[PDB]
Design a protein around this ligand. Structure first.
Ligand SMILES: NC(=O)c1ccc[n+]([C@@H]2O[C@H](COP(=O)([O-])OP(=O)(O)OC[C@H]3O[C@@H](n4cnc5c(N)ncnc54)[C@H](OP(=O)(O)O)[C@@H]3O)[C@@H](O)[C@H]2O)c1
Ligand SMILES: NC(=O)c1ccc[n+]([C@@H]2O[C@H](COP(=O)([O-])OP(=O)(O)OC[C@H]3O[C@@H](n4cnc5c(N)ncnc54)[C@H](OP(=O)(O)O)[C@@H]3O)[C@@H](O)[C@H]2O)c1
Ligand SMILES: [Cl-]
Lengths: 270, 272
């Protein structure tokens, strides 16, 4: 190892990843955060103890990895600002910009630009993010482990062979938390419909969701098999489940993710 | 962490508490699991390294705490089978059974001061469980602290003022993990329908659910407010939400929890 990582933009996602790295003992001297405004840089400067600058070029100078963490409308401007610094350099660029495809990023940066596109989600802010990654052709294996490692600082990381699967990631893990929020609400309010106080129902619902997710993660069993541990033949759970299967949830979700992916394609910048 | 704990029955709930306790550092030597059939005991003996025995009375013998982890319609006999051994000492008895009210247990055992009802769930295995606890006023504070110390080791604890609250908690967090497992199944198979691999769909689904609960748990913001914060207008997420909102999920879950409670109320007429 020996990687200088520069984050262009000092926003929420950059902060997520930087704090994740710092917390895992990543050398703070090997990190640079550039931001347009000074306020945000105070945090990175004082608390994180990483390098800060308001000059993207200075910031990117000598970096092995440049992470593009600016809002999507600023992505072309920052690229054009760094095209000369990053030209024929073998430097890895990680794009966090939603919707922005790699070929489009290549147009701005050069043709042999080494690009990884990340699709992280909101739970990144609580160190439980799910990130889908797509790697350019130019990206060498070392850089793929590097990209994966950096994004693992905020949660788990998967790869897709084709960049068109990113929109499917966005629809699943990108928009997924919202789905769970909706679910938790419905479940919460059902519990409250019975004689459970709002506070108890809220807490139990969240712990229940947390626990089922933890179990699924740390266990070999499928979610089907884990469901069996909960269900006794002719038991209470089985009756509640029969009702949930009444609602045709697989199909409900298929339409939901389809709507999401369709929208993602329309919003996709190429 | 010093009590001798004997689980009567070694099924799913027993297995998950025990796995949870061991994971928390609980001395395997202080735990005993019994079960009418032999095969289930193998896991406890070989994976957990805890005492196993096919004989309820032998397991209960030295226990400082006895956890009844048999079906609700098997609680009565188990209580009669052990009535004397339990009453003979201040052995704390924790019933996990749904639809077995303390009054019935007080009858089974002829005593009513060492009875705590606990409504745990399977994520206890990973120490991320949720357990409703109930105990009548006849149960002193140190017995209640004991039960709590034990259930707290595998996850959150919530004491409730009435027993029907426990049965409500049973339909929420007791059966809850199954609901989540079902949603996760539906979600990841939907993701596979769109063309993602099984492994990726499973992993992202799992992690997505975890992340959502985490965000929920780490803020005082409601789930609704988090949903808004996460949904931009005209965006990808909003499209999916609009589909989901038409699934009438609030009503689906209300209908589902109630059907769990009514079924619980059916079993309770049966446990005597
Ligand atoms: N949906 C998601 O959770 C997801 C996940 C990961 C990444 N992303 C993408 O990653 C990007 C970051 O999002 P975010 O919410 O973390 O950001 P944010 O907090 O809303 O703002 C990003 C930061 O970039 C800075 N910036 C803007 N123009 C700049 C420039 N020309 N040079 C240097 N810095 C500049 C801004 O600084 P000031 O405004 O303070 O001056 C701002 O603080 C977005 O494009 C987003 O789409 C999305
Ligand atoms: N599982 C859950 O998600 C959950 C959640 C909350 C509460 N609970 C409560 O926990 C209790 C146990 O449920 P579970 O799902 O864990 O049960 P389970 O896996 O179906 O079986 C419990 C075990 O008890 C054994 N048993 C039956 N009669 C016995 C006896 N007379 N003496 C000794 N052992 C006996 C059975 O042995 P054999 O099968 O080998 O005959 C069985 O293995 C229930 O009362 C339930 O209401 C469960
Ligand atoms: Cl150094």
């Amino acid at each position: 190892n020996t990687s200088n990582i520069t984050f262009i933009g000092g926003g929420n996602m950059a902060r997520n990843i930087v704090v994740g790295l710092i917390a895992n003992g990543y050398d703070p001297n090997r990190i640079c955060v550039t931001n347009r405004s000074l306020d945000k840089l105070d945090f990175f400067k004082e608390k994180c103890g990483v390098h800060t600058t308001q000059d993207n070029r200075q910031g990117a100078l000598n970096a092995d990895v440049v992470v593009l963490a600016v809002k999507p409308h600023q992505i072309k401007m920052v690229c054009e600002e760094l095209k000369d610094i990053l030209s024929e350099t073998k430097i890895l660029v990680i794009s966090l910009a939603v919707g922005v495809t790699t070929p489009l990023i290549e147009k701005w940066l050069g043709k042999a630009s080494r690009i990884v596109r990340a699709m992280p989600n909101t739970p990144s802010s609580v160190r439980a993010g799910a990130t889908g990654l797509f790697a350019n052709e130019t990206v060498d294996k070392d850089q793929k482990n590097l990209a994966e490692s950096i994004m693992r600082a905020v949660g788990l990381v998967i790869w897709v062979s084709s960049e068109d699967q990113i929109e499917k990631i966005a629809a699943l893990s990108g928009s997924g938390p919202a789905y769970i929020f909706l679910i938790m609400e419905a479940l919460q309010e059902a519990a409250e419909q019975l004689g459970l106080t709002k506070e108890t129902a809220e807490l139990l619902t969240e712990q229940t969701v947390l626990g089922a997710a933890r179990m699924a993660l740390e266990t070999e069993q499928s979610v089907v098999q884990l469901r069996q541990f909960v269900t006794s033949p002719g038991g209470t759970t089985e009756q509640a489940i029969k009702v949930l299967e009444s609602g045709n949830l697989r199909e409900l979700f298929i339409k939901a993710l389809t709507a999401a992916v369709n929208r993602a394609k329309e919003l996709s910048k190429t």
